[PDB]
């Protein structure tokens, strides 16, 4: 109690009852479980991103606006169904719904567009249809590709090649859907930007009772690697027809978050279901509760010991900033990023503080939704003559956006992470600031 | 051998951290140990057939639940009889006979405050018909448990009371309820309506953890494999749910509509068996045992002291089983609370105790039917040999295996105090 | 059941701490030691401690092992010392429940490349005179231990070889030396000349830790209470040194000139006794036993499995003692390696084993001289009660206390497999 | 080759038992000696030429025992020490500051004695940096010493000597009002049983480490070196164990004040401390210090833990911190980093007083303030790099953590930077 006594007198006894704080202060995992309280409300913003599959039930511009308000971060286009003309209309409807909020840049929410490929099917390499669908994604500016049935590192190289020179910035999330993919996992993850645990096909290729081992191992290996991991298929399946999910479904969503999944997905739930906005609201509600129940004491310590020593200033500054954020119960970590890399390196250490990422890249702002706990802000202002002043304006943009969105209150402490010179890869500074 | 250390997630359990443990989980690592989490199957039209109950017993059913919300007393007496007929059809081979507990799930107080009039009549029925367990519905305070204990009368003293926590008051008064109950049931169906649906997993995880700490059984209930009522295979969320209830530390898992009225009752039991076996191998025993050890308070009870010594000994030699003689099941329960990887093979002459130990994870009851030998230590050895022969026949033991034998210094319950290291010959 | 006063003594609040930093902060100088002194005291016999009457005073002060330095004195001189020690020890053998055995150790002169001619003659002398231990000087490699082992003629294979690590070669070849030795001695005198004086503490701490991991005795030797040769009280560095050797994990502590030629031989023994008692209470058993537990490999030896089960059981009930029946001292040694807080009362019929177990920390030997009983189980029982009766008489046990009893299933060495939880009546 | 030195295999161990087993006598210490050495000044160590040798041997703090000698005697000692220290001021990149500490006579049979009030006023008039207040029994005793220093003796550090049973029992109230503690084992070994002193030492060191306040281990550390050129096996063990316990400072009383080998006793304490610091199990030490330290909303406190964590991640050669009062360097020190805390200060008093904190290497900056504050900071950081390069702490290619503030004055430390040397 001596390690909380002073901050208890300062922040109050009511602060330390919320967001499962008594449970996270526990010395053991058994004590942590015993200290979980249903009356302990989550205060932090929802960090696990929600991928919603776009279909007939969620294609209208007006419906898409409701899903954005409900918590949709990434829009998935399943290229197994629909024509190129159909998917181009979906992309346009999504962009129209997202840009309807651009009038207020302090409260604008970027939404990523992901292309889920049909797959190789009976074939060995990349199918002819996949090459055409990938060329479509490049021409239409998709941010992510969920490459279906990845079975080796050569499969991911084929997808990167089909994207061409212009599709270099697109993120490749390899869907592990069969036994070969599970066995060659380490070689696949090495060449991928992240992974997707495609439980539907995986539950047919391997025994249904073994899928949870594959999900847990893949999530843990992705967490170790610092790369995003998506949990997919049948998460809230009953919500396709019913307004409330089963006890197994709510348990499943919460357990995917507890395992360490960066993203959670809705397939039929939002693409063809009667309750698409309600499925997004439900995933948001469960994720918020599950994230508070994460045992950060052992999680951070294990992530820290497992991570190898590094001489990269971005990597060093990231662990220093996350450690600083935990020490003062920082409301947020504000980071300036160009490619999203600095925000990704903060994210891998799983801080309780929100990683508010300020970027000028619209693509990077959409793609950082793949990383848990990263809240992107798109800076639209033109560059100042003095670089040091341009940096200060972006930091103030992050504070004003964070104050307006409820992340920051006056009196709160924030960690600011910046670089010494412009251009990607020079992040090396950490500042402790008091919100005034 | 090298082959032994690749099975039952042994590389994953040897890991120094939980993150390393997760990364070392192998889908090609097959489970070796017997399924420890017991399966409760609700009895209804789909599962009352004597021939069907035999198939469910073979599939892995350990406890038969009678839902007193549906049916008359005449209906439930026919269920009890059909279950007993199916269970006793295997009594001809005592080395492979599997005891099955009968549990009475009460209707509940509903609008009322105390124990309803129907519940008092249903509880008296349970006593008259020899039920082993009671799942008392909508327990809100310790006085509710006392009312159930009182309705059971003097003859229902041996019956176990598992308090169903189905509402917010029960979740808040949990500590006082668990103190007076024999165990708990996380009744997720009503709980998911009384409290926000998105908070039920916190209540499940807290209750399971508190029960694990207390050394009392905890059942995870409702909608575990719901789609198996109509479909031959479950959803990805359903298999995940079953596995996560086992990983959380649930002693029992339950089937309601999946076995009461569904099209796949035997298939539902086989599925819960298959998932539990996988999930139990994936349990991180290194931290689990260490935390259970540290958390458990000091004790001057020889049964309690012998239990921790035996579990520690079982871990040191990778014991295939811990064979314990128990009259009331208590010795077996105290071994179980430390979550050993070794099976707790419990030999008992009490048919009621043999049925009731299914509530404790990892306890495999054996009913000894032979009459007592004149020389006590000879009778004790015959029981230990019965446990070895049963374990050999059922696949738990092989020649060359090491086994921990837990016994007492004199006849009668409460005198366990000895732990022996034995080599299977 | 024990009281608030029990939990304030023997640094019990400090041992319950969750961290080592918290453990240090909870050390109380007002917390008095209750347990008996476990770290054994080796006293060098010389002109200052050779008389039968002086030896009786040193036995009463706490001397467990008598060291004969073969660097000084003739074979006739050392034979008279052996006879005087045996006469002083047997003067108390009329009251067998309270009789204390004392080991005799021969410290060799030293090598030259191989075993010297004088060492071969001195080792033959040790065998002919029934010495229990040999402190082999300047061991540099495993071949040196084999030469001493070979020199312990045909009769002396039972003698324990404690390898003195006195130079850089011994420190580097440590693993191969410890593998073939019965234990080690950190001979700091010569080691402080062969290697930089400021590096000796690293060698001491590494060697003690490796011996603790191996389960073999480790002696801390030279200049522990050097000022007590001339002065009646030691320096602040000397008391700190003795306490830190105990805290590091040393099984034995030694007095060279302090006892052999000094002015205060009985006072140096009393001082080492006083400091060791304090230091043992301050040991952080929570992390010590958990690390010893994890570091020790899995074993399929019933003696090794029973030992960890018994120490775990002893800790759970705060057992006053662990009574182990041993013939070679092995079972007591395996209990000792897990560093229990309970005294290991070892009952043996071997006078040599009774003397040699003083090398193991926390082992209190009892030589049992009684005529054997016709029924082996009754003979087992008489020795267990002999251990309790002696324990009661010496202050280790009271009626109501809990004890752990380790025995085997059949007579003869190497069959230890039972652990019983007994209440002292 | 880097990973075989400074007990790096032993520090990477998953358990403390494995850590002990991995200690290598052939693993040489590379880092600079962090535990500061206090040397008592007497007849054997009073000459200006003798003092210069002790400064070169490793003396960081000079103790004046006011139990022996007159005010005129001690003023001559102060002057001789200052003359010996300032003889090296010609090269500011290699100049070593030396603190002057006044050890009071004590209350004896008696509150604060009349002689102590006179000796404390002497210390103020002569600019002493530290006071070792003898026989502190309660918090009111510390308040009496603070009062006897007056309005001129505000910046003086008070190290309370715990020498009796009452002081050990009232420890928490004494430490709360003191700047640090001294485990005065000589009198403590007479007031309490000799066999219980190690419990008091270990508890006090641990409580000081938890509090983030300096702790000195004192008396009979190398006692045999008063007459002999080499210490006993118990003495080398004792010095090493005081460092291993977590003592910020180690002391030499008769060993330097009246002993035949004063320079040799300083060299011996330096040699043992260097070895003992490498053998510190940082894995569990840092983790326990981190968990035990309470949450803080002070940016200096938050930046300190962030910087130490960053230093461990890259195996930083040093942490360079810009400090006015020594507080920022003290907060880095409490987390026991393996990287040297190179503290750049303009205060000469602060530079002398940071020797009380383990691992802090003070540098006195003697250049005038620049017009642009941004450039004045960069010059002090470069002074720290050049001093560190010259003194062997840094090489080109090494990584350093730089800790600065956002605005001048004390208490505004809030920035951490990862820098690559040259
Ligand atoms: O040993 S266990 O199986 N699991 C322990 C554990 C430890 C750390 C974390 C946080 C975490 C979460 C995800 C991670 O990938 C990761 O590195 C750390 C979770 C669980 C266990 C289960 C139930 C109990 O009651 C109990 O005492 C022990
Ligand atoms: O129980 S023990 O005495 N504690 C070990 C321990 C652990 C960490 C540190 C470093 C440390 C960490 C944090 C501190 O605050 C601090 O003062 C020191 C030192 C000692 C022990 C355990 C296992 C053994 O094999 C053994 O010989 C002894
Ligand atoms: O995350 P990335 O891709 O490394 O971008 C972080 C970059 O942001 C900065 O803080 C400023 O970026 P820009 O000037 O390019 O907009 C750099 O110092 C740093 O290199
Ligand atoms: O677990 P319980 O019910 O306490 O039963 C343990 C008891 O069983 C025994 O092992 C065997 O005794 P019985 O011969 O009465 O069955 C007793 O020695 C011990 O007291
Ligand atoms: O410690 P040791 O040398 O292995 O001997 C222990 C032996 O002592 C016993 O407990 C009793 O046997 P004895 O009667 O022959 O002494 C054995 O059963 C056990 O094997
Ligand atoms: O150690 P202290 O007393 O807190 O002072 C640290 C100070 O060092 C600085 O980095 C530089 O200080 P000055 O400019 O006053 O010399 C400040 O920003 C900070 O306030
Ligand atoms: O493609 C998918 O999402 C799957 O197979 O689960
Ligand atoms: O009775 C039950 O199992 C429920 O309500 O969930
Ligand atoms: O012989 C010894 O013990 C020594 O040299 O230290
Ligand atoms: O004054 C002191 O330092 C002592 O007595 O040890
Ligand atoms: K698809
Ligand atoms: K019911
Ligand atoms: K000798
Ligand atoms: K003095
Ligand atoms: Mg698929
Ligand atoms: Mg209900
Ligand atoms: Mg020698
Ligand atoms: Mg004094």
User: Read out DSSP for D245-292?
Assistant: HT-SEEEESHHHHT-S-HHHHHHHHHHHHHHHHHTS-HHHHHHHHHHH
For the segment(s) B38-280, the CATH number from 3.20.20.60, 3.40.718.10, 3.30.930.10, 3.40.50.300 is 3.20.20.60
Query: What tokens were used for B358?
Result: 């299914």
Query: What tokens were used for A255?
Result: 């357990």
The hierarchical CATH code for the domain A296-434 is 3.40.1380.20
C-alpha distances in Å from residue C100, one per residue of C46, C86, C352, C366: 21, 11, 13, 7
Taking the CA of residue D65 as reference, the ligand 10 atom at the shortest distance is 1
Q: CB A433: neighbour CB atoms within 10 A?
A: 17
What is the rounded distance in angstroms from the CA atom of residue C210 to the CA atom of residue D23?
10
Angstrom resolution of this structure: 2.5
The half-sphere exposure of A319 on its side-chain side, counting CA atoms within 13 A, is 26
What is the rounded distance in angstroms from the CA atom of residue A250 to the CA atom of residue B201?
7
C163 φ/ψ angles, rounded to the nearest 5 degrees: -80, 120
Residues of chain C with CATH 3.40.1380.20: 285-423
**Measured between CA atoms, how close is D1 to chain C, in angstroms?**
18
**Partners of residue B406 on adjacent β-strands:** B324, B419
Helix axes of B50-59 and B265-281: crossing angle, nearest 10 degrees: 10
Partners for B (CB, 8 Å, 3+ pairs)?
Answer: A, C
**Partners of residue A376 on adjacent β-strands:** A357
The secondary structure of chain B in percent helix, strand, coil, rounded to multiples of 5, reads 45, 15, 35
Query: Is the backbone of residue D392 left (phi > 0), alpha (psi -120 to 50) or beta?
Result: left
Helix H, strand E, coil C: the string for A70-128 is: HCEEEEEEECCCCCHHHHHHHHHHHHHHHHCCCCCCCCCCCCEEEEECCCCCCCCCCCH
A320–D416 C-beta distance less than 8 A:
yes
Residues of chain D with CATH 3.40.1380.20: 282-420
Q: Which of C299, C308, C422 sits opposite B312 (nearest CB)?
A: C308
Ligand having the closest approach to the CA of C22: 2
Q: How was this structure determined?
A: X-ray
Where do we find the tokens 């020889």? B302
Query: What tokens were used for B333?
Result: 């329960």
User: What fold is seen in the domain C40-279?
Assistant: TIM Barrel (3.20.20)
What is the rounded distance in angstroms from the CA atom of residue B55 to the CA atom of residue B265?
9
Cβ-Cβ contacts under 8 Å for B167 (sequence gap 6 or more): B138, B140, B190, B191, B194, B195
- Kindly provide the b/e burial profile for residues C194-218, where b requires at least 16 CB atoms within 10 angstroms of the residue's own CB: bbebbbbbbbbbbbbbbbbbbbbbb
The half-sphere exposure of A331 on its side-chain side, counting CA atoms within 13 A, is 20
Torsion (CA) B98, B101, B102, B104 in degrees, nearest 10 = -160
What is the rounded distance in angstroms from the CA atom of residue A224 to the CA atom of residue A294?
16
C-alpha distances in Å from residue B115, one per residue of A316, B128, B143, B159: 63, 19, 10, 17
The hierarchical CATH code for the domain C285-423 is 3.40.1380.20
Taking the CA of residue B283 as reference, the ligand 1 atom at the shortest distance is 3
Ligand 4 binding pocket, CB closer than 6 Å = B 325-328, 330-331, 407-408, 410-416
Which amino acids of D are annotated as binding site for substrate, given as ranges?
A: 63, 161, 186-187, 219
**Measured between CA atoms, how close is C84 to chain D, in angstroms?**
32
Helix axes of C52-61 and C75-90: crossing angle, nearest 10 degrees: 60
What is the rounded distance in angstroms from the CA atom of residue A195 to the CA atom of residue A173?
5
Residues of chain A with CATH 3.40.1380.20: 296-434
Strand (E) positions, B24-169?
A: 38-42, 61-67, 101-105, 133-136, 160-165
Residue A186 · residue A213 · CB < 8 Å: no
Name the nearest CA neighbour of C382 among C303, C323, C329.
C323
Contacts of B26 in chain A (CB under 8 A): 213, 217
What is the rounded distance in angstroms from the CA atom of residue A95 to the CA atom of residue A93?
6
How many CB pairs below 8 Å do chains C and D form together?
A: 179
H-type helices in A163-275, by residue range? 179-183, 185-191, 199-205, 211-225, 247-259, 268-271
B221 φ/ψ angles, rounded to the nearest 5 degrees: -125, 160
A6–D294 C-beta distance less than 8 A:
yes
User: Ligand 1, atom 12: nearest CA belongs to which residue?
Assistant: A299
Helix H, strand E, coil C: the string for B299-336 is: CCCHHHHHHHHHHHHHHHCCCCEEEEECCCCHHHHHHH
Contacts of A415 in chain D (CB under 8 A): 306
CATH 3.40.50.2300 for domain A49-291: no
What is the rounded distance in angstroms from the CA atom of residue C293 to the CA atom of residue B289?
12
Q: How many angstroms does the Cα of residue B129 sit away from the middle of ligand 12?
A: 18
What is the rounded distance in angstroms from the CA atom of residue C346 to the CA atom of residue A14?
57
Ligand having the closest approach to the CA of A345: 3
DSSP string, D64-75: EETTSS-HHHHH
Residues of chain A with CATH 3.20.20.60: 49-291
Where do we find the tokens 């066999």? D195
The half-sphere exposure of A327 on its side-chain side, counting CA atoms within 13 A, is 27
What is the rounded distance in angstroms from the CA atom of residue D392 to the CA atom of residue D394?
6
**Partners of residue B161 on adjacent β-strands:** B134
Residues of chain D with CATH 3.20.20.60: 33-277
Classify strands D249-252 and A49-53 as parallel, antiparallel or unpaired.
unpaired
Residue C65 · residue C43 · CB < 8 Å: yes
What is the rounded distance in angstroms from the CA atom of residue A376 to the CA atom of residue C85?
84
What is the rounded distance in angstroms from the CA atom of residue A358 to the CA atom of residue A394?
7
With 0-12 / 13-18 / 19 or more C-beta atoms within 10 angstroms meaning exposed / middle / buried, residue B121 is middle
Q: Which of A212, A248, A282 sits opposite B224 (nearest CB)?
A: A248
Which amino acids of D are annotated as binding site for ATP, given as ranges?
A: 65-68
Tell whether C249 is in a known binding site.
Answer: no
How many CB pairs below 8 Å do chains A and B form together?
A: 187
Architecture of the domain made up of D282-420:
3-Layer(aba) Sandwich (3.40)
Query: What value, to the nearest 5°, has the Cα angle with vertex A264 and ends A263 and A267?
Result: 130
**Measured between CA atoms, how close is B323 to chain C, in angstroms?**
14
Query: What tokens were used for C75?
Result: 């074979």
H-type helices in C68-141, by residue range? 75-90, 117-128
Query: What tokens were used for C305?
Result: 């499995």
What is the rounded distance in angstroms from the CA atom of residue B157 to the CA atom of residue C69?
73
Residue B260 · residue B47 · CB < 8 Å: yes
Architecture of the domain made up of D33-277:
Alpha-Beta Barrel (3.20)
What is the rounded distance in angstroms from the CA atom of residue D90 to the CA atom of residue D81?
16
What is the rounded distance in angstroms from the CA atom of residue B197 to the CA atom of residue B211?
22
**Partners of residue A175 on adjacent β-strands:** A196
Name the nearest CA neighbour of A281 among A10, A52, A12.
A52
Which amino acids of A are annotated as binding site for beta-D-fructose 1,6-bisphosphate, given as ranges?
A: 337-342, 387, 394, 421-426
Best C317, C334, C340, C398 member to test B by mutation, with max B CBs in 10 Å, is C317
């Amino acid at each position: 109690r001596a390690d909380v006594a002073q901050l208890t007198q300062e922040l109050g006894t009511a602060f330390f009852q919320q967001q499962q704080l008594p449970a996270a202060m526990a010395d053991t995992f058994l004590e942590h479980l015993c200290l979980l309280d249903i009356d302990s409300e989550p205060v932090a913003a929802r960090s696990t991103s929600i991928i919603a599959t776009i279909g007939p039930a969620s294609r209208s511009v007006e419906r898409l606006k409701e899903m954005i308000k409900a918590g949709m971060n990434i829009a998935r286009l399943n290229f197994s169904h629909g024509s190129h003309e159909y998917h181009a209309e979906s992309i346009a409807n999504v962009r129209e719904a997202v840009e309807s909020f651009a009038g207020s840049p302090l409260s604008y929410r970027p939404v990523a567009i992901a292309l889920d490929t049909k797959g190789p099917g009976s074939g060995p390499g990349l199918s002819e249809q996949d090459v055409r669908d990938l060329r479509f994604g490049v021409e239409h500016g998709v941010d992510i590709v969920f490459a279906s049935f990845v079975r080796k590192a050569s499969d991911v190289a084929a997808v990167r090649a089909a994207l061409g020179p212009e599709g270099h910035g697109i993120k490749i999330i390899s869907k592990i859907e069969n036994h070969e993919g599970v066995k060659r996992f380490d070689e696949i993850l090495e060449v991928s930007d992240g992974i997707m645990v495609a439980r539907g096909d995986l539950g047919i290729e391997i025994p249904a009772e073994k899928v949870f081992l594959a999900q847990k191992m893949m999530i843990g290996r992705c967490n170790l690697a610092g790369k995003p991991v998506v949990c997919a298929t049948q998460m809230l399946e009953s919500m396709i027809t019913k307004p409330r999910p089963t006890r197994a479904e709510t348990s499943d969503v919460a357990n995917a978050v507890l395992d360490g999944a960066d993203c959670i997905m809705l397939s039929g739930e939002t693409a063809k279901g009667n309750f698409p906005v309600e499925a997004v609201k439900m995933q948001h509600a469960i994720a918020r509760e599950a994230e508070a129940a994460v045992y950060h004491r052992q999680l951070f310590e294990e992530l820290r010991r497992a991570a190898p020593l590094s001489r990269d200033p971005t990597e060093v500054t990231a662990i220093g900033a996350v450690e600083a954020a935990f020490k003062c119960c920082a409301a947020a970590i504000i980071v300036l990023t160009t490619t999203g890399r600095s925000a990704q390196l903060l994210s891998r250490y799983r801080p309780r503080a929100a990683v508010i990422a300020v970027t000028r890249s619209a693509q990077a702002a959409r793609q950082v939704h793949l990383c848990r706990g990263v809240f992107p802000l798109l800076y639209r202002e033109p560059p100042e003559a003095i670089w040091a002043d341009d940096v200060d304006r972006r930091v103030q943009f992050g504070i004003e956006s964070g104050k307006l969105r409820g992340f920051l209150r006056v009196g709160d402490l924030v960690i600011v992470v910046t670089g010494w010179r412009p251009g990607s890869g020079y992040t090396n500074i950490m500042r402790v600031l008091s919100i005034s």
